Structures are given as structure tokens and as C-alpha cells.
Amino acid sequence: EREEAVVWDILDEVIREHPVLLNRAPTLHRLGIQAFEPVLIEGKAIQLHP
Amino acid sequence: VQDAVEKIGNRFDLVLVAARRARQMQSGGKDALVPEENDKPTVIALREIEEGLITKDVLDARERQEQQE
Amino acid sequence: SVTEFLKPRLVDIEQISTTHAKVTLEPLERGFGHTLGNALRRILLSSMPGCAVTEVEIEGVLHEYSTKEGVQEDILEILLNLKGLAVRVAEGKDEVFITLNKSGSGPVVAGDITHDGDVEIVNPEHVICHLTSDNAAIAMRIKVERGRGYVPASARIIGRLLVDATFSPVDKIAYSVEAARVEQRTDLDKLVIDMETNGTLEPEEAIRRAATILAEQLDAFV
Amino acid sequence: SVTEFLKPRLVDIEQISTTHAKVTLEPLERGFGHTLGNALRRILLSSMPGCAVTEVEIEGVLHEYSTKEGVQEDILEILLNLKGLAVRVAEGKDEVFITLNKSGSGPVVAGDITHDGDVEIVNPEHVICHLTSDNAAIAMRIKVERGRGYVPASARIHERPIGRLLVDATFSPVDKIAYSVEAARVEQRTDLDKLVIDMETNGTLEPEEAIRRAATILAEQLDAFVDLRDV
Amino acid sequence: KPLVGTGIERNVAVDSGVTAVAKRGGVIQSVDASRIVVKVNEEELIPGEAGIDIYNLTKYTRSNQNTCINQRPCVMPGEPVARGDVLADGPSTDLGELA
Amino acid sequence: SIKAMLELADLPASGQLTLFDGRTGDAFERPVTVGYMYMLKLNHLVDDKM
Amino acid sequence: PSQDVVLGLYYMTREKINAKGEGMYLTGPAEAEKAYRTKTAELHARVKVR
Numbered sequence: 001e002r003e004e005a006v007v008w009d010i011l012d013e014v015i016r017e018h019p020v021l022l023n024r025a026p027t028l029h030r031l032g033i034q035a036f037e038p039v040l041i042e043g044k045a046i047q048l049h050p
Numbered sequence: 051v052q053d054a055v056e057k058i059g060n061r062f063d064l065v066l067v068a069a070r071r072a073r074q075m076q077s078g079g080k081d082a083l084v085p086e087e088n089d090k091p092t093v094i095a096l097r098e099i100e101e102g103l104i105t106k107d108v109l110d111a112r113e114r115q116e117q118q119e
Numbered sequence: 120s121v122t123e124f125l126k127p128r129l130v131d132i133e134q135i136s137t138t139h140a141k142v143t144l145e146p147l148e149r150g151f152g153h154t155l156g157n158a159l160r161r162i163l164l165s166s167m168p169g170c171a172v173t174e175v176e177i178e179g180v181l182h183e184y185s186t187k188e189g190v191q192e193d194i195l196e197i198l199l200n201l202k203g204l205a206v207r208v209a210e211g212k213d214e215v216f217i218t219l220n221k222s223g224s225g226p227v228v229a230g231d232i233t234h235d236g237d238v239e240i241v242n243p244e245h246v247i248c249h250l251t252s253d254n255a256a257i258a259m260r261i262k263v264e265r266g267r268g269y270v271p272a273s274a275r276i277i278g279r280l281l282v283d284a285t286f287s288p289v290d291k292i293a294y295s296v297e298a299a300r301v302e303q304r305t306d307l308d309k310l311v312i313d314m315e316t317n318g319t320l321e322p323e324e325a326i327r328r329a330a331t332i333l334a335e336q337l338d339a340f341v
Numbered sequence: 342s343v344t345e346f347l348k349p350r351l352v353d354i355e356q357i358s359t360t361h362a363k364v365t366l367e368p369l370e371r372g373f374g375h376t377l378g379n380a381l382r383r384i385l386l387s388s389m390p391g392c393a394v395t396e397v398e399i400e401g402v403l404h405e406y407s408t409k410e411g412v413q414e415d416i417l418e419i420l421l422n423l424k425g426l427a428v429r430v431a432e433g434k435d436e437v438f439i440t441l442n443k444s445g446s447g448p449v450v451a452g453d454i455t456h457d458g459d460v461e462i463v464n465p466e467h468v469i470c471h472l473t474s475d476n477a478a479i480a481m482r483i484k485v486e487r488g489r490g491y492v493p494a495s496a497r498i499h500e501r502p503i504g505r506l507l508v509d510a511t512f513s514p515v516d517k518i519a520y521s522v523e524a525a526r527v528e529q530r531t532d533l534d535k536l537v538i539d540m541e542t543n544g545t546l547e548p549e550e551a552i553r554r555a556a557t558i559l560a561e562q563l564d565a566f567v568d569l570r571d572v
Numbered sequence: 573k574p575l576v577g578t579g580i581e582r583n584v585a586v587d588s589g590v591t592a593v594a595k596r597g598g599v600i601q602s603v604d605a606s607r608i609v610v611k612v613n614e615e616e617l618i619p620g621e622a623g624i625d626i627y628n629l630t631k632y633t634r635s636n637q638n639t640c641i642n643q644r645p646c647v648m649p650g651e652p653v654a655r656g657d658v659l660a661d662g663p664s665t666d667l668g669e670l671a
Numbered sequence: 672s673i674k675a676m677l678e679l680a681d682l683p684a685s686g687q688l689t690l691f692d693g694r695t696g697d698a699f700e701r702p703v704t705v706g707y708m709y710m711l712k713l714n715h716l717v718d719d720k721m
Numbered sequence: 722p723s724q725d726v727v728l729g730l731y732y733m734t735r736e737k738i739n740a741k742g743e744g745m746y747l748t749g750p751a752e753a754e755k756a757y758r759t760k761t762a763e764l765h766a767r768v769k770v771r
Contacts, residue, residue: 005302005303008303016088016090017089017090017092017093018090040305041305042305042306044717044718044721045717050726121390121435121487121488121489121512122390122554124388124558124561124562126561126562126565127565127572128572129572130565130569130570130571130572131571132569132571142569144565144566147562148387148388149387150383150387151562153383153694153695154379154380154383154384154559155562155563155566157376157379157380157694157695157696158376158379158380159566160758161372161375161376162376164755164758164759165371165372165759166370166371166372166373168343168344195746195769196746198746199746199747199748199771202748203748213342213343265343266343267343268371268372268759269755269756269759269761271742271745271756271761273742273745274761283745283746290751290752290755291751291754291755315751323569326566326569327566327567327568327569329566330563330566330567330569331567332346333376333559333563334560334563334564334567335346335348336346336348336349336373336377337377337556337559337560338348339348339349339350339351340351340552340553340556340557341553341556341557341560375696376696378696379695379696382696383693406632408604408605408606408631409605410604411604412604412605413603413604413605413645413648414605415605415631415642415644418644446649473602473603473604473648473649474602474604574709575707575709576707576709637714639714700764
């Protein structure tokens, strides 16, 4: 809750190889949900590969 | 994951065997047969399958040997 | 402080070969990666001193579009092959003449060029042309000068055949800027330079020389 | 010769106005004019130190979203106007306090700020606020800090008394940079060029000084490449 | 203001009611960021009237969508105004034009 | 009328200028349409949507 | 790919008559890139490449 730096390092090492599922509604076909490797970015919006 | 599915033959069986190996390395005390290189257990298991060290038959044989002992 | 700036702390040089290299520098302040990479690219491509083939004399050939009997390649292809000749000239010599004489059937290569000992050929396996007939011979007189950058034949416009001058040893330079972070500052720049030289110089030495030129140009203001 | 180049020198400085100037570098070899111009433009527009207003304290004011009697502008507008104050602080000080008291109807401008002689106001005619009554009075304590770049109020790391108002600070004195590479007539050579840099600033930083700081930054960053080794 | 407009912005700004419009003409006696006091003209006075028009301006009031509603004076003390003239600009209004 | 206004303001009649890349300093190969547009900030903020 | 990727690949691969550096001989793609970066030849110059 206090957001220390070592908390950020722990978060970096947690998601190092933890895939995450991205979905957009409507899900017309199975390509509407896909697994990606997360990269932490300073911001509030998800960055998607074109 | 192309090499792993080529060595195993089926993606689903590959997933199951890799999950068993990852749980062995994480929950149990088994060590990796390849250099970890700061990798998660799933990736290490996938690399082991890609190198051909780990398969379903090998896991069954090791489990049988452990049960015998 | 206002005058303090972040300097690279991780510099990694990876050598693919004796002429190919990749240099990674991190971390850099925001926008400095592009500045340094672009300046280094311009200096290495259009301002690096070096020695290259400029002119050639071929016996029996008057124009670049003329034909010679016994050579598989055309005149322009021979000129292009001559362009890709890594040549080193001893310091203090600007203009040098070398010769290449060979008769027979087979590949006429760069190892058959006779020089004065003040000229070193880095790639003796370089193929200059191909002779098809056993009665065919080639006699060429090549001029090697010292210059800067990439000067083509058109910009430099008797029997003298002009060859595009690749004075700069740099054959290829590319730079990429990726995101690097220290502490919680995620806006830093990491610079990756992929370099390939002709063989006269090592890529790291070429980068050092370009940096030396750029820094010396600013000595009057620092 | 071919190995040896010619080093440019600062040959002309022109001051068209307090906030506008032209600097001439000559001579330059082929292609070096564009390289130096682009590098200097990027460094000048990004990494030039300056002085900016960071904190304000107005008597009788608790928060920015408020009003004061006899003043046409809200405190938010006054702070936005204070953001455009051009202040030069004498070297050796990274923090200074200035004071502005004014009573009576009229435009309260930057020329009414009382400083300690180590602070120079470059734009005395900058209108800060308006007093619409003879009984109206304004008393403000302004904090000016030296810095580099843009530091928003939120980015400042966190007691702060109620009444102290944070102001977003843009320290960089450089507003606009243009550069042109023209022909230079030096001795008998034609390949030599001349670089003219047009700088539009707030008047705080001298053009020659800014050029030298940009060159120093570029040289210090290049020192890593001049001594390329695995570290 | 919009540099490229259609000429309709004034109508929207005036008829929306977000701005402070002069009920009667006269000269602005007093201006402050929260109050505009207008001295009504002699020709536009009801017999036995004070002659003062007071406009109290809304300052930083929450809207239905959690957005600031603020009125900023656009007049100066002593300048003449007439009926229908904009005295203060409301949210998204610049000198009586929708912004 | 637009072209006459551009001519009055000492600007190209085509409305296209020569732009230079800030990263490299090189001019873009083709003229680029540069002007002024009235832009709005809609009430769809990433602060309220994360 | 779509949109800007397709536009860039189309523009880079187009063909122009009487461009700078037309008819030049190049040792390979590396020399083509070197010629482009040195402003010797345009992107649409018709050349012969090994």
C-alpha cells in the first residue's frame, strides 16, 4: 500500500514470465482473447501491438 | 513452443506434461536438468521438453522408480 | 544539480565477426540516444577519412560501355568489383598507383595485384573479374586516393574510368533507441548500434574515431 | 588535408531583442553544419537550466480555487500569470524568495516585485493581476528555484502549511530554436559552411552561454564513445 | 475561441444562461471576480428605484457531471455597457462566444 | 477565399509546408499539411476508466 | 499489415523516372542503404544491385 521501490522490483520479477489474457468485447471468434507477455509502462492505458 | 510440440507431438499432451514437470520443480524438491537462467518453472519445463530430456514416459519411469524406493 | 547528467554505466560490445559488431550503451537521458546515434551515423557515413579506389585504366577499353573480349563480366561489373576493395595506404601518401596483370582462364582476384609495399589489401580473396579464353589477358592500372565519405562517380564528373569511392570504412551502421530505466525513472534511453566495416578498421575503433572527430569539432566552446 | 578538419568558432552574436538572438558558427566542413545544428537544437530545447516560480503564498488565501476582494482575477489565473515570470538568479543560489505588495487600483505588474539585488526581473511589464478598488491590497511571497526541465507539482516528492500554493515549473529558458546552414567565404575554399542559430528565449539565458553549455553536454556524453570499453 | 467558426456561438452562449448578461444599460461601477455592480442609465430607470444592478457570479460550483462551473468577469470598471451585453463568461465561453 | 487569405498572410496557397524531422533534422520528402484545428477533450478519461 | 505499414512498404517500393542516382551499380542492400543515407540516391531510383 505504501508503494516502496522493492515492491516494484518484486512486481517486475513476478510478471517476468507470467502470461496475461487480453480480451475485447464482442468475442466473435477465439482470436478475441489472446495471451501476451506483460511489460510494465508508466501510464493508465494498455498498449496493444498493431 | 514449436520445438516442444514437435518433440511431444500434441499441444495438449505437451501442456499436461509440462505442467506436471513444473509442479514437480515448484511444489516438490526436484531440480531443473537445464540451467535456470532466471526462468519460471513452466518455461524451464518447456525448455527441458525442447531439449528432449523430459517426456511422459520419462516422468512415468521416474515416478515408478520413486515408488519402488 | 542542473549541470549533472546521466552517463552510460553498462556498455556491452558483442563481436559477431572481425568486421561486425553490436554496441549497447545504457542508460542515457531522454532524447540523447537519437542525437548521438544520428551524429555518429552522419560522421561515419559521410565524414570518415579513408582510402578507396577512385580511377582505373583498362587496356583496350575506352568508355564504360565499351566491350572487352575474353572477360565474362562487363566493364561496369568490373568497376563495381573494384569498388569493394579494402585498401590501406601508408600514412603520408595521398595518391598511389597499383597495377594488376593476369593472363589465362579463371578468376582474376585481388591477390594478384602488385603494389609497392605501402598498400595493404585486406581481402586478397576478393574476385575482380573472370577470364574465359586462354588467349585473353587483363592489364589494369588502379588509382587509390585518400578521402572522406562516399563520393560517387557522378559527383566527380582520355580513357579514364571513374569508380565510386567508398572512402569511409563503414559499410553499414544502424542505431536503435529502446526504453531503459533506473530506479523509477522509466523514460531513459538505451542505444544499440549495429556496425559492419570493410576490414580496414574494427567497428569499435571506427566509433571511437567518429566520436573523436565530433568532440574535437566542439573544442572551441567547451 | 583529409585527416585534419577545421574547427568552428563563434564569429558573430546578434541581439535582435531581449528575447531573440542569432549566433553564428564558422567555419564548418561539409555536412557538419546539419549535424551540429540538430544536436545543439535538441540539447538546447531539452537540457537548459533556468529559474522558475515554484511556491506562492498570498495573505488571506487558503487554496487556488478561491477569490480575493478587489482583484479581477482568481488565484488560479494569478498563478498561471506567475508561471510566465522571467527571473534571473545570481550564480551560487538555487533558491530565493521575492515579495510583492501593492495597494490601490491599477495593473499589478512584475516591476513591483521587491528583490534582494541578486534577482533580476527580465520582463517588468508582465501583468500579474489587476486591482479594481482603492481599498484593495495584495501581499504575496514568491519562491523562485533553479532547475532543469519541467517539474509538475504532483511529481515533487512529499509538512506543508495550508496556504502554500504549488506552481508547476518549466525551468528551461529556451522557447524556439531554428538553424540554417549557408555558404561561407573563407580563404579560397568553397566547401566551408556557416551555421546560424536563431534562439527565442525568455531573456534569462545569454545566447553564447547557452551554446557553451550545449557543447559541454554534448562533449561529456561523447566522452563515453571516445573511450569505448566494456563497463 | 474557435478560429474557424460558424457565427452561431454567440447565440448559444447568450441563450444557454451560463453567462452574466446585462439586464439594463449603464456604466460598470465596480468589478471583482465575484461581483459586478452596474450603474443603470438615467433613461432606463423605474421611478423611485435605487439605480444599481448587482450580479453575483458563480465560482467553482460542481456540475451534474463533476465539472467546474465558474464565471469570470470580462468587464473593467468605468466602461459603458448596454442591454444584452455579456458581463461575465461562464464555462466554455470566451467574450460571449462558445469556446 | 481560403487561398486569398493564405496569400494575405504570406503563406503557401496549397496549405502545405516543408517539415523537418526533429530526431534527424532531415526534411520530409513531401510537403505536409500544417494548420490549426479546433480540438476538444471529451469526457472519456482514462482516469475514470481504469 | 494494414494502413501505415502498407503505405510505407508501398512508398518505399515504388518506381520513379529520372531520380537521383539512377543507373548506379550497387554491391548489395547495405550499399543501397548507404547511398540512401548519404543523399546520393533516392528511394525510388532505378539501379542495378548484386
